[PDB]
Design a protein around this ligand. Structure first.
Ligand SMILES: CCCCCCCCCCCCCCCCCC(=O)OC[C@H](COP(=O)([O-])OCC[N+](C)(C)C)OC(=O)CCCCCCCCCCCCCCCCC
Ligand SMILES: CCCCCCCCCCCCCCCCCC(=O)OC[C@H](COP(=O)([O-])OCC[N+](C)(C)C)OC(=O)CCCCCCCCCCCCCCCCC
Ligand SMILES: CCCCCCCCCCCCCCCCCC(=O)OC[C@H](COP(=O)([O-])OCC[N+](C)(C)C)OC(=O)CCCCCCCCCCCCCCCCC
Ligand SMILES: CCCCCCCCCCCCCCCCCC(=O)OC[C@H](COP(=O)([O-])OCC[N+](C)(C)C)OC(=O)CCCCCCCCCCCCCCCCC
Ligand SMILES: O=P(O)(O)O[C@H]1[C@@H](OP(=O)(O)O)[C@@H](OP(=O)(O)O)[C@@H](OP(=O)(O)O)[C@@H](OP(=O)(O)O)[C@H]1OP(=O)(O)O
Ligand SMILES: Cn1c(=O)c2c(ncn2CC(=O)Nc2nc(-c3ccc(N=[N+]=N)cc3)cs2)n(C)c1=O
Ligand SMILES: Cn1c(=O)c2c(ncn2CC(=O)Nc2nc(-c3ccc(N=[N+]=N)cc3)cs2)n(C)c1=O
Ligand SMILES: *[C@@H]1O[C@H](CO)[C@@H](O[C@@H]2O[C@H](CO)[C@@H](O)[C@H](O)[C@H]2NC(C)=O)[C@H](O)[C@H]1NC(C)=O
Ligand SMILES: *[C@@H]1O[C@H](CO)[C@@H](O)[C@H](O)[C@H]1NC(C)=O
Ligand SMILES: [Ca+2]
Lengths: 479, 247
């Protein structure tokens, strides 16, 4: 290949629109690909491919899919150094994002009749093939950081601000008025006396909550699969209760209803804030873990809610004269509370027994032992083991999942921004001053390929030897 | 930071050696000094080899725990601010900050079901009974069960990861200790105390990868030899005599 390139050989496609680079990639010929890369004419070799072909795509995507160790060299070619002296301050590193851009750029014609390329093509190709060693290369890291500081940080701080604009005045209202009291824009109704100090803050916060609820209703009606999501339910509850909490801005309302809606609003607000936090990378793996553990716990209540029924309905009969067990529902809630080890042995079992107030002493003490064995020991250890397994499974894929979240974030953001804006904020390179403020499988695969080549050569040799025997001269050693 | 705090508070604890001082300030500085002294002693202990791996484990677990408070401090806010509204007539929940501290204390399973929920309910002293009992169930599920099991699983993973490299890390600590000590002692002293040999009387008071690598090398040598042989055979064919079997 090097000899044929040194002479001016043409670079064309065939009947399958495959160039020689596609054939070298599909057969995992590493050395010829490295030769094509290290040489001149690499630019035209890269440009020669053609769209519209579902089998022979852009050379970069194919190189990511088949020979990632060559893509690593291709990326190493994109880091330039200045003085090559780590101590110097004018020593800067320049990163070039030449091969991560859209394939529709390489071709000069670019018809794009039916060709639609998704944003961040190279990074998505790396994610869909688990090329974690490539996603950690400094060029890709700087590419993602550039995208972030270019528009992602801003597009998400706007969302956080739009939510906090209703989240913060709610909390300010709660911790500044005594629960149970009625209040309107004029002040606090002390039943009638009217406390009027701090009325300005109260009015401002009541207006900011109202506007946020209205805009949330409008946005959600604009989005209206919908009822299936959980965020939709949470936000519907938040807006419906927050609009009632501050309703005395227009029409009177009983204080009881007002504060019983405030108690739900102020809880679901801060519970929904975690779904906003799950975007950022330093603190979004904990939300994944929390969700996994919560799902695993909820899938087992369909089973381990009959243990509670058994024990609660038996304790309702055995200990019926005591207040905690004086009703079926109260007796089931007390048994749920005893699940962590708070059994009240001395208050519910020993002291009534020494007063001759247990109707069934032997059964009551046998139920205590069987409950202690079954629920605070066996069931809790089962849950702990399940959680340990789930967290290990999540940690096994932490880095790839963390990077894929960011890639998907920016990919989704690209499909909604206007074209001219992306043109304006996009960059082609970056400059950095440092001073200023799975292996064993690959090995055995390679040696399998080597063994197959060995077999092929040995068979050719065998044929040659048989030819020798059938052509030679035999005179003195004839039979 | 630890040593700055220690010295600044220890100098105030014993200041009446020169200038008078109120007893309140003296003992409130002593309470901080006597705590940070014994907390800083562990950083001295972490050098010795029989007991320095536990400090590594402690540090790893503590860092992992502190990286998640930026998240799981909003669960506490949610539950504390809702309990402040639902159970406002009770002393433990009579203020936002007290209500957030009580919720932090309930995280280990000390919920006070009978004292805060059942007995006020049987006296008709709960303002919102159904909501108060629903919050109890959701809290019990979310925090003493899910969050604590999450923390336990994280700790198990971290400790396994630390134990995987225990021996190498243990030896590297000693090597680095002595290396750093060598760069500061005087030359003649190192000459004086260094030895060249030692005498001991006993009586007196990752493999699979290496294997496949070796066999890869063997396979490459085999290929090379086979190619040389192929060339020799082609030479034989192009030099031999052919007379009776000619076409
Ligand atoms: C009858 C009552 C039935 C209740 C059923 C609850 C199901 C909860 C499921 C949670 C879940 O899946 O989370 C996933 C979520 C993540 O959801 P998600 O983002 O994975 O959702 C799907 C999105 N895709 C497909 C892209 C992945 O994990 C979390 O950590 C969520 C945190 C907030 C959860 C808030 C739930 C509150 C429930 C309270 C119930 C009791 C209230 C009592 C009244 C209080 C009054 C003060
Ligand atoms: C998978 C679950 C595995 C575990 C299951 C465990 C269940 C069976 C074991 C129960 C052990 C506890 C039994 C407590 C008996 C009463 C204790 C007591 O009051 O002691 C002082 C009193 C003192 O009595 P006294 O001397 O004042 O005379 C009255 O003991 C008794 O009242 C009776 C003596 C003990 C009798 C034990 C009988 C055990 C029967 C077990 C099966 C029941 C069905
Ligand atoms: C507002 C308050 C913010 C507090 C923030 C605390 C952060 C603690 C981080 C600990 C850590 O990283 O340890 C690493 C340490 C090890 O540090 P290290 O040795 O790894 O430090 C870096 C060194 N290299 C880079 C070489 C590795 O692990 C330990 O086990 C430390 C044990 C002692 C820690 C003492 C912390 C005390 C904090 C108390 C706070 C509350 C006091 C209240 C008043 C009491 C009055 C009586
Ligand atoms: C991710 C989280 C998952 C879990 C979320 C769980 C939240 C929803 C389930 C809550 C279960 C506990 C409900 C307790 C209700 C009151 C208990 C009580 O006082 O019982 C005796 C009393 C006895 O009443 P009475 O007979 O004296 O009449 C008054 O029961 C009641 O007061 C009413 C009967 C029970 C009503 C249950 C309604 C459940 C509503 C759930 C959603 C709420 C929002
Ligand atoms: O032609 P090279 O780039 O030098 O690489 C090949 C070989 O390539 P494969 O991995 O495709 O079999 C290995 O290269 P690396 O994996 O190390 O990159 C090998 O490695 P070992 O020597 O460790 O066995 C050795 O390359 P290198 O000497 O750079 O390590 C060898 O080439 P040579 O045996 O002719 O040096
Ligand atoms: C999504 N993502 C990153 O997060 C990221 C990144 N490159 C660096 N970061 C670091 C980072 O976490 N940055 C930021 N964290 C916050 C933040 C943290 C806690 C909060 N809790 N509160 N209140 C609220 C906001 C704001 S900016 N890239 C490429 C990216 O895609
Ligand atoms: C750092 N190191 C070793 O530790 C070591 C060693 N060879 C043997 N040792 C054993 C050892 O632990 N020795 C010692 N342990 C203490 C000690 C223990 C507990 C204390 N707690 N208190 N109070 C205080 C001091 C004193 S001497 N080599 C080569 C080394 O480099
Ligand atoms: C906010 O609530 C206060 C308290 O009820 C309202 O003030 C009362 O208004 C009525 C009607 O004018 C008077 O008869 C009462 O005497 C007022 N109360 C007091 C204590 O003076 C006030 O109108 C409410 N504000 C709004 C906008 O509805
Ligand atoms: C006004 O509020 C105080 C407590 O804030 C209360 O003691 C007093 O009874 C209230 N006044 C009336 C008329 O209810
Ligand atoms: Ca929504």
């Amino acid at each position: 290949v090097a000899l044929l390139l040194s002479h001016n050989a043409d670079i064309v496609l065939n009947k399958q629109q495959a160039s020689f680079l596609h054939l070298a990639l599909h057969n995992k010929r590493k050395e010829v690909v490295l030769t094509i890369i290290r040489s001149k004419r690499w630019d035209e070799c890269l440009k020669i491919f053609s769209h519209n072909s579902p089998g022979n795509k852009c050379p970069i995507t194919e190189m990511i899919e088949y020979l990632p160790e060559c893509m690593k060299v291709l990326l190493d070619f994109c880091m330039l150094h200045s003085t090559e002296d780590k101590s110097c301050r004018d020593y800067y590193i320049e990163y070039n994002f030449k091969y991560l851009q859209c394939p529709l750029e390489f071709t000069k014609k670019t018809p794009t009749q039916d060709v639609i390329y998704e944003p961040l093509t190279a990074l998505n190709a790396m994610v869909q093939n688990n090329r974690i060693e490539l996603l950690n290369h400094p060029v890709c890291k700087e590419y993602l950081l550039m995208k972030w500081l270019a528009y992602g940080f801003r597009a998400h701080m706007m969302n956080l601000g739009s939510y906090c604009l209703g989240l913060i005045p709610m909390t300010i209202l709660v911790v500044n008025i005594k629960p149970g009291m009625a209040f309107n824009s004029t002040g606090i109704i002390n039943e009638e006396i009217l406390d009027t100090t701090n009325s300005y803050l109260i009015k401002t916060c009541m207006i900011l909550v109202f506007l946020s609820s209205i805009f949330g209703y409008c946005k959600e009606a604009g989005q209206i699969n919908y009822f299936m999501d959980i965020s939709n339910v949470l936000e519907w509850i938040i807006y419906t209760t927050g609009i009632i909490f501050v309703l005395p801005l227009f029409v009177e309302i009983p204080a009881h209803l007002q504060w019983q809606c405030g108690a739900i609003a102020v809880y679901f607000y801060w519970m929904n804030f975690l779904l906003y936090l799950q975007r950022f990378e330093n603190c979004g793996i904990f939300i994944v873990m929390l969700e996994v553990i919560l799902k695993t716990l909820l899938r087992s209540t369909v089973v381990f809610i009959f243990l509670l029924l058994a024990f609660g309905l038996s304790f309702y009969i055995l200990l019926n004269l005591q207040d905690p067990f004086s009703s079926p529902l109260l007796s089931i809630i007390q048994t749920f509370s005893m699940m962590l080890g708070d059994i009240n042995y001395r208050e519910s079992f020993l002291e009534p027994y020494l007063r001759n107030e247990l109707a069934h002493p032997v059964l009551s003490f046998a139920q205590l032992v069987s409950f202690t064995i079954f629920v605070p020991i066996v069931l809790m250890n089962l849950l702990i083991g399940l959680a340990v397994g789930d967290i290990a499974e999540v940690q096994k894929h932490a880095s790839l999942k963390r990077i894929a979240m960011q890639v998907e974030l920016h990919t989704s953001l690209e499909k909604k921004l206007p074209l001219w804006f992306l043109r304006k904020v996009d960059q082609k390179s970056t400059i950095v001053y440092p001073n200023k403020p799975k292996s064993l499988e690959m090995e055995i695969l390679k040696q399998k390929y080597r063994l197959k080549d060995l077999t092929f050569l040995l068979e050719k040799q065998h044929e040659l030897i048989k030819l020798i025997i059938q052509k030679m001269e035999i005179i003195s050693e004839t039979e």
